[PDB]
Amino acid sequence: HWGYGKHNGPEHWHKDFPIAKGERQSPVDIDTHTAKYDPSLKPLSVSYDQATSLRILNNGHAFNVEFDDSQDKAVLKGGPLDGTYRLIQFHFHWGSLDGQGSEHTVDKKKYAAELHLVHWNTKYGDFGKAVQQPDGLAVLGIFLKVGSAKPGLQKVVDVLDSIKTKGKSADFTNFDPRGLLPESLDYWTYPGSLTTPPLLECVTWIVLKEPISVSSEQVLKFRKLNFNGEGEPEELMVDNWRPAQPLKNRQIKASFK
């Protein structure tokens, strides 16, 4: 029964998931004045030309857009990674107000929201096996600021009314995640964790430096979702972000000078 409230939010998660106080927790603050440029880092390869979305789902904590990951179709490679990671889903974290919502922060700056594109290492065969490995997942994180609309987001925005409450899902085919990417693939990278329970330390994080812009109208539609199920007291799905966790014995490495 974890969530984002007073009584079940991030500060409580350690009770059911003790790794919440582990050595490689996410998100973190990205200090741009101490992250070092790493010339050994490679350009990120994002190959989403054959990505096939299936469906969108409200899970009571965010919504997930899902992909058919049965074929080698939508993959992330290069960057800091060895081998090939397959896209399984994306989701967002966002705020009640534009001044908060991101999980990672940049010199303590909070963005209005953050997109996570989740990929599993094909060497482990499926997602469930991958999350048991320190190099099992690669998550591409992209900041959202409020300004111009993102045309490529509008298809997601316009299905949310059909998945208002926890447990509702809808068919969601042919969505192109390339429409959610900024121009630059410059990134920061570090080893960390899932940012929701079970908080497993299985993620190579790749956080893009350039945010995308979405409109106030687009974010407002996110904020009309509900954490609760149909026929339960209404609690708006807002502030579904975990705050920055201690960096501990990690370095954040920059792909760019």
Residues comprising the chain, all counted: 257
Using the rule CB under 5 A, is 104 a contact of Zn ion? Answer: no
For 154, phi then psi, to 5°, come to -60, -40
Written as six digits, the tokens of 53 are 């979305």
Stretch that binds Zn ion, among 191-199, 222-230, 237-245, 248-256 (CB under 5 A): 191-199
Q: Is 7 part of any known ligand binding site?
A: no
Q: What does the H/E/C string look like for the chain?
A: CCCCCCCCCHHHHHHCCHHHHCCCCCCCEECCCCCEECCCCCCEEEECCCCCEEEEEECCCCEEEEECCCCCCCEEEECCCCCCEEEEEEEEEECCCCCCCCCCEECCECCCEEEEEEEEEHHHCCHHHHCCCCCCEEEEEEEEEECCCCHHHHHHHCCHHHHCCCCCEEECCCCCHHHHCCCCCCEEEEEECCCCCCCCCCEEEEEECCCEEECHHHHHHHCCCECCCCCCCCCECCCCCCCCCCCCCCCCEECCC
Using the rule CB under 5 A, is 24 a contact of Zn ion? Answer: no
From residue 192 to residue 231, what is the string marking binding to Zn ion with x (rule CB under 5 A)?
---x------------------------------------
Judged by CB, which is closer to Zn ion: 118, or 160? 118
Rg of the chain taking only CA atoms, in angstroms: 17
61 is catalytic: yes
Stretch that binds Zn ion, among 11-19, 73-81, 109-117, 179-187 (CB under 5 A): 109-117
| Smallest separation (angstroms) from Zn ion to the CB of 93 | 6
Q: Is 12 part of any known ligand binding site?
A: no
Judged by CB, which is closer to Zn ion: 59, or 213? 59
Total site size for Zn ion, rule CB under 5 A: 2
Judged by CB, which is closer to Zn ion: 38, or 127? 127
Q: Is 91 part of any known ligand binding site?
A: yes
For 122, phi then psi, to 5°, come to -65, -15
Stretch that binds Zn ion, among 25-33, 78-86, 190-198, 223-231 (CB under 5 A): 190-198
Using the rule CB under 5 A, is 116 a contact of Zn ion? Answer: yes
Of 7, 61, 104, 119, which residue is the catalytic one? 61
Judged by CB, which is closer to Zn ion: 36, or 88? 88
Q: Is 104 part of any known ligand binding site?
A: no
Minimal CB distance residue for Zn ion: 116
Q: How many CB atoms lie under 10 A from the CB of residue 99?
A: 11
Judged by CB, which is closer to Zn ion: 58, or 195? 195
Q: Is 196 part of any known ligand binding site?
A: yes
| Smallest separation (angstroms) from Zn ion to the CB of 161 | 22
Q: Which residues contribute to the annotated binding site for Zn(2+)?
A: 91, 93, 116
Q: Which residues contribute to the annotated binding site for substrate?
A: 195-196
Contacting residues toward Zn ion, per CB under 5 A: 116, 195
**Mind telling me the catalytic residues?**
61
